[PDB]
Design a protein around this ligand. Structure first.
Ligand SMILES: CC(C)(COP(=O)(O)OP(=O)(O)OC[C@H]1O[C@@H](n2cnc3c(N)ncnc32)[C@H](O)[C@@H]1OP(=O)(O)O)[C@@H](O)C(=O)NCCC(=O)NCCS
Ligand SMILES: CC(C)(COP(=O)(O)OP(=O)(O)OC[C@H]1O[C@@H](n2cnc3c(N)ncnc32)[C@H](O)[C@@H]1OP(=O)(O)O)[C@@H](O)C(=O)NCCC(=O)NCCS
Lengths: 390, 390
């Protein structure tokens, strides 16, 4: 007999909550707001480039903690390269767990069980670092039991929504009764800065990144007629894509978090993703036996790093345009919320599936993929099973 | 019929490697070196405080990446409060994975299996942050498979050696054939600063903290006559101690990593540890059945945050004076190396047990405790089983 009993069934998503800052910035307004608040309106050619980036972003609106009032009170955030980190940390070490608490409370409310039943916490963010960390802060805000087993995943970046599921799978499955609270919370105050015409890749982030937090309850063996599974975690993989050193770098500097991109992140992802998914599906559906579903028969929860990534993955895999509809809906209404985004998309998908009276929580499809992409270049792959509806 | 097959036996430590910077700094020399290099010899009462901290440290020597040459070339490190973070990061983002590579290569050599059989990586450090992180850097330096499942645990602090085992346990046990490389690597260049008489708590670190990296191979179901288990992981727990808000804080600032560190941390830990261990042992050895071993029939791998912690725990728990001998030997020869220290002690203990021809890898005792303490105040408790010798 093991000294810690393990669970039997697959780790399952039992609830999803989300939260965003109340301030909404419409993309139509953003070039004028951003170049005005950063005192950059003399940079007319650069502003024209940024206008084109926003026009092509496939982002209609974003929720941002930062407001004009906060920016006017804190000029070091509006410069391109001024010492700020201490100010940025003072903000996000508080606001990242606070936003995470709102998402977690929503997940716990849906779950419907006492928060004392939570045994583990995973907190993922790319926004700030501290000791004790955002996991400790969230546990205190929520009133979790003092013996909850916590894990803080800092400086993860845009693949982190995959990472938290890959870790939560083993916590839930190897511990009988475990209920894992998973929180991803992202606030762009850590990276916001003024524009620079020698760093056009930093402008990309200004057009795409939004704020938000998402939370899950993950556990194996849901209690019948009490808990409800929405998705099951069945297979995980992680890959460093070949020839991708430096494709996406991010450094925590005295001026805050800075990013350095390569212009064909979309090419690197789209040229390698097919081989990764073919191998994953072959391992989940081995011949010896049902064949893998085809790509267009899966449901897709894909990190929308930018519209060009989505377009090129679509093209190379032969996806029909509607496969990424839920993904694009979140990008359109929230922007790129880094690690939190795929869980917003998971929530969007199950909600659309219920509303449209489809046969499963994954748009009627049995099997599906959650994909995160980020610094490395790292690709996180999670093979999911939906749950039948009514 | 799991899509990912799980393992059967307890997660086991199959190899341990360690590495330290070659520069050895003897504690008897350190007050004069430190106050000399920071231009502080006129601070006579402050130097007397530091002299007594060193005299009572129970640290005879430490290994430090920083040298007199590096300090003289980088005077912002020798002041108490000067912007330095970018310089410190430039050092530790590179040197922390480099030191980790040395420890990992030693562990892999002992393990004796090809590195391509490593399936997972956990990298823990309190020294620097970057994207991609120290996990990515170590994987690239070692040439691990591109599909290794990585996890970077940043800004953990001194409980991280317990945390990495808590996570590795579930990675190893829930994944058939998984072999987890676990690395903790710490370099005090992130925190070194000049002395200040309003911040004696910072001086504490200058007397105690040293540099080092440790690496484990962790896996379930070791291959008979091929792999060798040294310790087994059987039970894990984590607790936030009551009335401990602010006891150990650490902030990543523009001046580097800063610590705020309360007097009687030792009292908080020693007031609470008995109830935590009585609870843990009661869960590992439940009545329904052999009783828990007594404290003095366990082996002890205790994070030596400072000698006062060890002395007060030893007193409160009634430990015989030799129970903490392996722990105090690592403190004496290496200082407090943050999350890496307990793995150095685990290595020291198995080596003493072999050399002295004792009955198990835990000094002849069957069961034992690994304890990490850090910001929270967080206590990580791991109940280990030794392995019988010859
Ligand atoms: C940013 C994006 C919306 C621009 O859309 P696009 O029309 O497809 O590409 P365009 O070539 O017209 O780009 C518009 C401008 O952005 C510039 N640009 C785009 N990506 C850039 C980068 N990484 N670095 C510097 N400049 C960049 C282009 O050079 C162009 O400038 P120009 O109009 O002065 O020539 C799109 O390229 C994208 O979605 N990228 C996905 C990858 C990514 O950026 N994601 C972030 C990471 S997780
Ligand atoms: C080793 C050491 C620091 C002990 O020396 P000691 O037995 O206490 O001897 P002394 O009392 O002469 O201490 C030397 C000086 O350190 C100071 N000091 C010790 N702990 C301190 C703290 N947390 N903050 C500020 N000053 C501290 C003492 O006050 C004293 O200076 P004083 O002249 O102002 O009285 C000791 O207090 C220790 O081990 N502390 C535990 C430290 C700890 O919590 N470390 C864990 C991790 S980062």
């Amino acid at each position: 007999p093991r000294k810690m009993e393990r669970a039997e069934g697959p780790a399952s998503v039992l609830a999803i909550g989300t939260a965003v800052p109340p301030n909404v910035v419409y993309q139509k307004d953003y070039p004028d707001f951003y170049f005005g608040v950063t005192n950059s309106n003399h940079k007319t050619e650069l502003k024209d480039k940024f206008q084109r980036m926003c026009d092509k972003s496939c982002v209609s609106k974003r929720h941002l903690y930062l407001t004009e009032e906060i920016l006017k009170a804190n000029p070091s955030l509006c410069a391109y390269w001024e010492p700020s980190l201490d100010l940025r940390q003072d903000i996000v070490v508080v606001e990242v767990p606070k936003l995470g608490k709102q998402a977690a409370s929503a997940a716990i409310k849906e779950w419907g069980q006492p928060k004392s039943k939570i045994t583990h916490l995973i907190f993922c963010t790319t926004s700030g670092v501290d000791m004790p960390g955002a996991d400790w802060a969230l546990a205190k805000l929520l009133g979790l039991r003092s013996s909850v087993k916590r894990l803080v995943l800092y400086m993860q970046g845009c693949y982190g929504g995959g990472t938290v599921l890959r870790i939560a799978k083993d916590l839930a499955e190897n511990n009988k009764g475990a209920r894992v609270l998973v929180v991803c919370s992202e606030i762009t105050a850590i990276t916001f800065r003024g524009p620079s015409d020698t760093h056009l890749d930093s402008l990309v982030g200004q057009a795409l990144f939004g704020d938000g937090a998402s939370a899950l309850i993950v556990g194996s063996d849901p209690v019948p007629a009490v808990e409800r599974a929405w998705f099951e975690l069945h297979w995980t993989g992680s890959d460093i894509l070949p020839n991708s050193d430096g494709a996406i770098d991010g450094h925590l500097k005295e001026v805050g978090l800075t990013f350095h991109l390569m212009k064909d992140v979309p090419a690197i992802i789209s040229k390698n993703i097919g081989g990764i998914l073919k191998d994953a599906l072959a391992k989940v559906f081995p011949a010896a036996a049902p064949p893998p579903p085809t790509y267009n028969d899966l449901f897709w929860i894909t990190h929308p790093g930018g519209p060009a990534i989505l377009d090129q993955v679509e093209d190379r895999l032969g996806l029909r345009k509607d496969k990424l509809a839920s993904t694009r809906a979140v990008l359109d209404q929230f922007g790129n919320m880094s690690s939190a985004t795929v869980l917003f998309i998971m929530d969007e998908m199950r909600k659309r599936s219920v509303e449209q009276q489809l046969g499963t929580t994954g748009e009627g499809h049995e099997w599906g993929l959650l994909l995160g992409f980020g610094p490395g270049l790292t690709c996180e792959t999670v093979v999911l099973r939906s749950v039948p509806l009514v």
